[PDB]
Symmetry: C4
Subunit: 388 residues, 4 copies
């Protein structure tokens, strides 16, 4: 087995085609299924896996009550083959209320964060053993991507933040070889707040589109040089911005450099990627709520400040249905690297108060150079049929 | 691993022997089991798998209600080893309300269709990744085989239809290499309506026996030339016709070339295969309903128009029990290629209205050159014992 | 991978040590577990598997009602790793109300019998495909070992019977190469009735200890010559006889040649094996009921007619607990072939009428050259705690 | 594959980082999960497994009642990948109410003890087959480690005791090659009572830290010479003693040689390991009950009698939560051998009498050379939510 280099061109895509759906919540009404949130997808060279953070309980279980909370000691990272729902034979890979995972061509790295808010621990598990750990550097919820990390030539990189969720924080980029931290670079450039990065290989480097939780409804960009560990950062140029909340399309702005100060506080994990001067991106359909999900290409979305000409829109989840986090993953093809994404479909509290739990299912799409139609692939559970 | 060529003679069979049964519905009354329909079987070079289209729910689950409907966004293709019932650890391979799968000797291809009736998307997934997609060409339920596709020397073929279910439609034959569509041929020949083809390798080509939903109770044939991509089509010669509905045996006809215009509208997926001038075929025992299942050889059934002399009949499911779809799969032996088939055993609505769901189990038989006796292997669930 | 020859001496044993227990019935009271009977064990070169005939239902399921019956179309052969209870992810290997399985060093052979009592079909499945089948030869419940067959140098042998259960029947010994029947030898010698053989390799041949259901409470022996397909048969010499029912030890007899005509009608599947002039054997503790289970060595039990000197007795299941069928399996060690056995622990009807089902768990012991103590390892379920 | 030698230096650790948690009890309230106790962890060269002794029943099951008892014939050793909770697909590896398991680099050895208190049997199962057995030598609960054994160059060693739990007993150290007992050494040295050893490779030998159930709240040490089979024993020097019960830190003593006669009777399985003159150890936080769990380094804890200066304390489970047994396992890294440990988190009787069962979950930590924070990772089940 050889290390991945991702040294192929990006697949030229026309949009996205359906790839996977797990129907977790519908199944939870007639089966023992894990309560989860913060899902993601990552693939080894042969096949894909779905990950999520468990809440230490199944849904039809009194312990599902009040699982809206983000951090308890019982949260563990779950890992199954993509499309295998989180049933009771699911492996809990590590203890984690925040995580990232990636395969370097030889083995899986898992970055697992747990413990006290003011003094958390990140464990680095590689090829089935604990190789390293780091403690909190700002004593304020050490946290990471909630999606796949990226490895080139046996060096994996992951973005982590510690500090305020509503003000300047301390973001660092780790470089990890076979589970061992070999270098840590501080964030540099013009991005002013970084959360929950969605990163992808862009050989010879790695590029991340993240969440600004402080002053931006435009999404920050972090560029990671894998050769010298140098970091740059900025914001997605597109005037059609990717965060939630955000302004209406007619009054939203980005200048590529600064947070836009437009409903900037709070946010949601999301993704985008560049193709030359253009941008492919997803976002919730609602400007204020985690409802619906759409993708489109923005002409000049990568290179032209405040560009708003979109094309090739697809509805993934219609706006009468709940969405959630979304993130990118990359899949090596015969001659190119494809970009895929997942959407977290959050059900229960706080939006749906008939039930006392909070959980999610997922839907997953992959880039295509072919053609496609239309649809909507929401969670699909009837809240009135659920155990409360 | 090398590509399959299927370049062995067809096994000379005397009939069929019992191979597998999953007891899905019986188990669903005391366990968490997927609601399914449109099952099939396909084998890699070592072992066989059962497939079906899930309805995004287990049976003992309020979401099972009104699963008689064919197309919802929560339908996914399920895949287990043959004989492993669809329990909660079952992998959902893709999103699909119509599908076909096949192994080319190196990896699995899945053809998965989902989305809006008037604008569906077919995804092509090979070796664990999305390689291609195509959109609806006639804006009227793009759809495919619901049984295995067939690959020779790395090229897989699958038959797809888009358009009216009760009139002239637009049928196309796709040729796919490692998940990439390399050629598309329109239907040609004398078949006037094609649905749900049951295809098999007949080196150097592929032969399909399908469903005419418009004017024929005789089954159409599609012949696929894998060298030059040319297509031919006709109808099975046998005067003992394979569709349901159909006329009784004394008043049924086929001329090998045209739909017979005998209770032609509607149909059921089924199969047959040639052996020289003769034909092995299955059909429902009832001429009007999806009840019972029988196989037999028709002497001159392939070559002689309106041939009605049968021999080697076997009852698979007696006529007091529900059947459903059936399809062929092929299994490479040491010196010959064997033909096998599955029968979908549909329980629930519309035939059984005590319950609100519709689901199925399967029974599976394989060609034998040996001897055998008699029996009947129906679904076996007591409708009165089931969750409603 | 090479064919097994079993060409090592038999391990010299001092008795038997505990090996496995599945606790099936206890688990069935809080879990979805298959209803079964007629279990057995067989091992490939690396590890062991438990087999049993399912009843097409779980225990906590209304379909478990009246599963005392031996033959229904829904019975399938289940196969798990030894000690994995028959949960809903269990693979149903074939359709069978009577079976035998064995691994030839390269792949699994399964012999699966199903269909009508007067016209059954035996399917021969090898390396995941149906290779052969045979129909009933006496039109009266074609049936086989309910324990492992035995293969030497790629030829597997299995004993089958068709005809009366209470009078002269037609017993045949099949020789099978990669699933294909290559020879069938009729029973020969002095054994007058043969059921449910427990066979083991005794290089260069195979030896079986079976059940006489007609005139003998002494167990018949069948010796199979794998070189020329010739058959011999006789009865176990031991005056301590192995069948149930049987006479008291003080009035039981065997002359090694004929059925003893001592409570000869009916019986139970069991086993024994030779070591020089001596015999290792198991039997129920009760003379009339399938209750308890004991093993011991009979001095001169193989060579001396009517020998009754036993030594090295062990209680496996005390006589306040239900037993059932038992059978031998053989396991290749570094320098010798070991003999192991399983005991079926039948619960429910007809003996326990609080519940309407009949099922079983298993316990498994292996020969040892070491030392051991005492115990009792019954099913362990409280009938009053069970779903009815 | 080659035999393990463990011939690398011990990793130099700063403390421990979170590795795994199974949430067994929380899940048992909404799923079918085994009742267990006496868990441990052991890894083959690629991955780690969790083990425990089942009670022949799931928790939500009337058979869970009165599972506080230590020895019934239905107890079996369960084995899953680490983090896969004990669901119904879990393999029962052998029959055992006391056990030890270890991988020698080529295959797994399991030591499984069951049967009558006064005449137990230990079975030795290697590479999937029973290779040896030994009977009770003192007729008083033959018993072993309840954690991993240790193998060097194909010879595995395990510590076993037979005799009084409250007085002089008969402890022996076994040496096992491919499942065959090749030598047995009696305990020698100054340890006066040995139970439940937690052993680890310390090339060229094996070192064990155990439980004195008679006169010591200081933990005994057993040193095993793998070259000549000689045995030495003593007590851990640390004045901060590891057993429960024990005196408070201001009045506890150890002289490295004798049991301290300080609340010596009874105990709990635990662990410690040397690093030069210092000692890493865990213990319950409570000095009288199995409540809480803490680790720390004792400066001079290995070499200096009655040393009480600690550093690098970590809370693993706070003292408001139940703990239980704990044990060490070792994991080979690239350049060093790491030490890890598990903590059994006992729920139910006798401490929690709302329910009638006794079961456990686990939490697992591994040595780290990096940094870490703080937390508490208790079982987490609400006793009021549980089936009784
Ligand atoms: C069948 O499916 C195909 C493929 O999905 C679909 O074609 C697509 O239609 C959409 C909508 O017209 C196209 O995307 C648009 O492109 C134009 C630029 O040409 C943009 O102006 C659009 O943006 C706006 O309008 C949106 C609502 O449609 C607003 O949400 C947005 O804020 C802008 O105002 C949009 O991006 C897309 O390019 C095609 N795709 C292709 C490959 O042609 C077709 O319409 C479907 N037909 C039916 C009957 O369902
Ligand atoms: C034990 O099992 C064997 C194998 O299954 C069985 O032998 C089979 O019997 C059937 C029925 O007789 C044979 O099939 C028939 O063949 C004749 C030609 O010889 C056909 O005319 C028959 O067709 C019609 O009759 C059917 C009703 O049986 C109608 O459904 C149909 O519309 C026609 O009118 C039919 O195909 C078959 O060939 C044999 N198979 C072999 C290998 O011999 C045997 O009968 C069973 N034993 C007992 C006692 O029943
Ligand atoms: C601890 O365990 C050991 C090993 O299991 C056990 O030793 C065994 O005891 C039995 C019973 O005494 C021995 O088997 C007997 O052997 C004599 C010949 O020496 C036979 O006569 C016995 O047969 C009869 O008695 C039986 C009842 O015991 C009747 O059922 C039977 O019909 C005959 O009348 C019987 O076969 C066995 O040989 C030893 N095994 C060894 C290896 O020594 C020991 O007794 C146990 N001790 C305790 C206190 O539990
Ligand atoms: C964030 O997490 C870090 C790492 O866990 C943590 O640092 C650790 O703090 C503990 C507690 O101070 C240190 O352990 C102590 O070391 C001193 C020697 O310097 C010992 O005297 C202590 O022993 C006693 O005190 C204990 C109570 O704390 C008693 O239980 C005990 O009986 C003794 O009386 C104890 O071992 C540990 O060394 C550091 N670890 C490192 C690597 O620095 C830090 O405190 C956390 N941050 C915050 C704000 O709490
Ligand atoms: C801790 C601040 C962080 C980014 C604002 O909040 C996240 C937001 C979440 C959210 O907005 O839904 C849920 C995440 N599980 C949470 N992360 C953690 C580690 O608790
Ligand atoms: C759309 C026409 C097509 C063939 C007549 O209908 C099928 C018939 C079915 C049927 O006759 O039972 C069920 C199939 N699930 C359905 N296929 C789709 C894709 O919905
Ligand atoms: C059919 C006669 C045969 C031997 C007497 O009866 C067996 C006895 C049984 C028994 O005595 O318990 C159960 C077996 N499942 C049955 N075998 C079959 C094939 O039905
Ligand atoms: C028999 C003495 C022994 C060590 C003191 O008791 C153990 C203590 C236990 C305990 O203190 O919790 C539980 C163990 N399951 C038990 N071991 C056996 C084999 O029954
Ligand atoms: C969930 O917990 C809350 C707070 O204790 C309680 O009011 C509510 O009844 C619980 N819900 C259920 C369904 O038990
Ligand atoms: C299924 O849905 C129908 C329509 O809403 C309803 O009348 C019926 O009661 C439902 N069935 C069950 C079992 O709840
Ligand atoms: C089992 O079936 C019998 C016969 O119909 C019936 O009398 C009995 O009530 C059934 N048992 C249960 C538990 O439903
Ligand atoms: C457990 O057993 C005891 C003793 O028989 C009994 O009193 C108690 O009710 C049982 N518990 C349950 C939950 O049935
Ligand atoms: Ca924001
Ligand atoms: Ca028709
Ligand atoms: Ca008899
Ligand atoms: Ca003590």
């Amino acid at each position: 087995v050889e290390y991945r280099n991702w040294s192929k061109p990006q697949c030229q895509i026309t949009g996205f085609a359906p790839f996977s759906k797990d129907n977790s919540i519908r199944l939870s009404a007639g089966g023992d299924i894990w309560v989860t949130r913060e899902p993601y997808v990552s693939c080894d060279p042969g096949k894909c896996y779905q990950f999520a953070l468990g809440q230490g309980t199944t849904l039809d279980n009194k312990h599902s009550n009040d699982t809206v909370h983000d951090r308890i000691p019982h949260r563990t990272l779950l890992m199954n083959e993509l499309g295998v729902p989180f049933h009771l034979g699911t492996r809990q890979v590590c203890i984690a209320w925040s995580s990232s995972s990636c395969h370097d061509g030889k083995a899986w790295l898992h970055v697992c964060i747990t413990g006290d808010d003011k003094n958390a621990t990140a464990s680095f598990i590689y090829d089935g053993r604990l190789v390293d750990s780091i403690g909190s550097w700002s004593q304020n919820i050490l946290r990471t991507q909630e999606s796949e990390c990226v490895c080139i030539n046996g060096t994996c990189t992951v973005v982590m933040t510690d500090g305020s969720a509503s003000g300047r924080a301390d973001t660092r980029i780790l470089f990890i070889e076979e589970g061992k931290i070999v270098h840590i670079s501080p964030l540099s450039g013009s991005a002013q707040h970084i959360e929950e990065c969605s990163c992808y290989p862009r050989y010879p480097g790695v590029r991340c589109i993240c969440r600004d939780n402080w002053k931006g409804s435009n999404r920050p960009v972090v560029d990671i040089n894998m050769e010298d560990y140098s970091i740059d950062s900025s914001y997605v140029c597109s005037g059609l911005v990717g965060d939630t909340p955000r302004n209406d399309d007619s009054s939203s702005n980005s200048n590529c450099r600064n947070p836009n100060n437009e409903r900037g506080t709070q946010g949601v994990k999301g993704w985008a990627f560049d193709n030359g001067n253009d941008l492919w991106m997803g976002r919730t359909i609602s400007k204020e709520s985690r409802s619906g999900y759409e993708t489109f290409k923005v002409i000049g979305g990568w290179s032209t400040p405040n560009s708003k000409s979109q094309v090739n829109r697809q509805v993934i989840v219609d706006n009468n249905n709940w969405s959630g986090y979304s993130g990118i993953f990359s899949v090596e093809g015969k001659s190119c690297i494809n970009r895929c994404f997942y959407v977290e479909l959050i059900r229960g509290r706080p939006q749906e108060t008939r039930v006392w739990w909070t959980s999610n299912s997922i839907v997953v799409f992959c880039g295509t150079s072919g053609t496609y139609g239309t649809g909507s692939w929401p969670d699909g559970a009837n809240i009135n049929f659920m155990p409360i």
